[PDB]
Write a protein that binds this ligand. Sequence first.
Ligand SMILES: [Mn+2]
Ligand SMILES: [Mn+2]
Lengths: 547, 83, 121
Amino acid sequence: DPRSLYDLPPYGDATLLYFSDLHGQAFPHYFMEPPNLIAPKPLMGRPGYLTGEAILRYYGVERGTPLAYLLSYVDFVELARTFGPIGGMGALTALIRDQKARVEAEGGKALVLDGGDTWTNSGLSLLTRGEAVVRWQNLVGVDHMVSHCEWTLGRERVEELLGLFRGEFLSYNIVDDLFGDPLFPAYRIHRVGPYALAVVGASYPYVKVSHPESFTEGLSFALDERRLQEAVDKARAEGANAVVLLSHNGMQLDAALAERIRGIDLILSGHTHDLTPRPWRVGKTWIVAGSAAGKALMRVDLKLWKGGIANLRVRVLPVLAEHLPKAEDVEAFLKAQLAPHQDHLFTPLAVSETLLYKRDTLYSTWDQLVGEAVKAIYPEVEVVFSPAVRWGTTILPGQAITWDHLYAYTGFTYPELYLFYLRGAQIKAVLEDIASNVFTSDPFYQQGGDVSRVFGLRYVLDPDAPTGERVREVEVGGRPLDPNRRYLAAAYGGRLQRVGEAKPGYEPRPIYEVLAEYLRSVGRVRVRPEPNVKVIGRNYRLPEVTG
Amino acid sequence: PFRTIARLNKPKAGEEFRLQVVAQHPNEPGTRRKLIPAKYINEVYVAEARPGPSTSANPLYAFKTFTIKLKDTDGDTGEASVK
Amino acid sequence: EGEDLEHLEQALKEVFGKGFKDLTPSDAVKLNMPAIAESGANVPAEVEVALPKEQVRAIHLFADKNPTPHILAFMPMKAEPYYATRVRLAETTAIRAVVETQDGKLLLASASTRVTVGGCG
Ligand SMILES: [Mn+2]
Ligand SMILES: [Mn+2]
């Protein structure tokens, strides 16, 4: 194949250069799709839960193609050396500029839309408090954006960064706590020749329960179906023909809103970190996923009519630095921004012998390394609870782990590792609480990422089982779980420390400081995929860690 | 002792209107913890409302010249007037 | 889902008299509440039904898992049946909505409000 994916013929009146969940990934790295996306029986086989060979057959993607490397985990190690690294702010800007140049030469309108989760969770982000990410958006020319993890910086910082942001921030759900007045506009109407296109902004509704309440004090994020319908109806009344929803509510929740809310013709879903080469049809609305770490740019060419979208062309463009031109302005910007932090962020700490992936529903190799790192420094710890966050990176066999990779994996604004005692009954109740939230038949009752990976214990999981029966046969350290016994637990980037009794003498310190202390001392890491979970009625897939 | 804010949600003839009532009071159920003493608000002049102990701090009241009165456990009447 | 038949029946007898089995299921009464509550204390609760103002007698809300099940009591004499409101919740509780009428029959409307912990993904 001559990788001619970018060279596309003219289509429609409008074009939306959409990308989501970049998470401040400034440099070209690797990001493997989850090997398993376990869903309950009524939600099996639908987009957002497809993995491996199943996702390739569904969209008709051939094995060994550039799209196959981005969509599936199958032959990832083999294709990562072949197609090179994905993402990077320089490679992403170069692709957006190239595609915007094509659309404008044809005679159409091109809109650059960001799908939230951009300003935080990286090396470049933490050192500038999300400022360098906002300044990059002005360089590329982002028209609109949404939020979720942007609020982790604090209310004062977000308001400060929005003033620097040249584009227009859109949100309908972000309202005041005491009254309920929207601080940001719900939508924006753009003139696309004889037609008018409206872009409705939707932010994550469970923002207050995801990160500490102090960051979003005096704000309401809650999902309002009445306010969403009113925003769509007001847009069409003003003169808009088609309605496009820039959302971060989650692909599953957006699909539930597609059958409940009228007027929406297209939904640009984020938060779930999914990929869609073909648009998902739910009722009378097309759903396009926004990917993760900026590995893909979704070009949505729209043909518009008097009552919405007539037809559409969805093309997932792979952001490959090895096959894309150089955006020297962004490269000079990133070099100047991280000039005194070059010897910190890029100096190798340890060389990995096996593949280190983050994305999965129950178990990942990177989270086992975190569990091994905590247990090596602190041998008193019996269980290491790791957050199942969708954002991160992937370490290839032979590739060295640097400080930038640690900030890409554990780049929380609250990275404090807490050592606290938990009762056996609490550990079982917590695992059941996440399972009832992740494996829910109704997409409305879904919150956060995946099921939290706990190193030290082994358990049998049944997703189709009722609440309080999903988690069974729990065994801590090769011995069955005693509900009265006090087990020492270690957790970071959560709220588990609130219900647990804190360890005396211990002071909470950042997780990346603990990880670097382990990596520098060992020199080399050999983490083999050993799943501590047994799924009932589902086949748990395992990727190739060698190559 | 009490702070009350009232606002209408221009009303068109025939169509149904909304009344937004909000007051600055720290509502406590008593169960939350040292133990915090229970202090909560437990009326329109057409419609009477009596909330229980489980009420959030600084709550919102929705109803479909206006004078409103709110009484609590201690005895602090909350009055607000709107045209 | 936060169903607790033991604590709910204790409040229904001391306030009204009739238990859970005596309550009649209904589809007309709609209860608008979020699936997952953003705050432990600040939780929005909306209730509305399409029927004449004269027919309305009393509107009540109850929490199963909460120690104190009594949430609120609203009697609209001349006003239309409607009450968004912020009420406290202890844990994963299913909020029940009951409407009293002149006929004698008690209407039902069930909706669950989950209280969970997570991380920014
Ligand atoms: Mn995300
Ligand atoms: Mn997100």
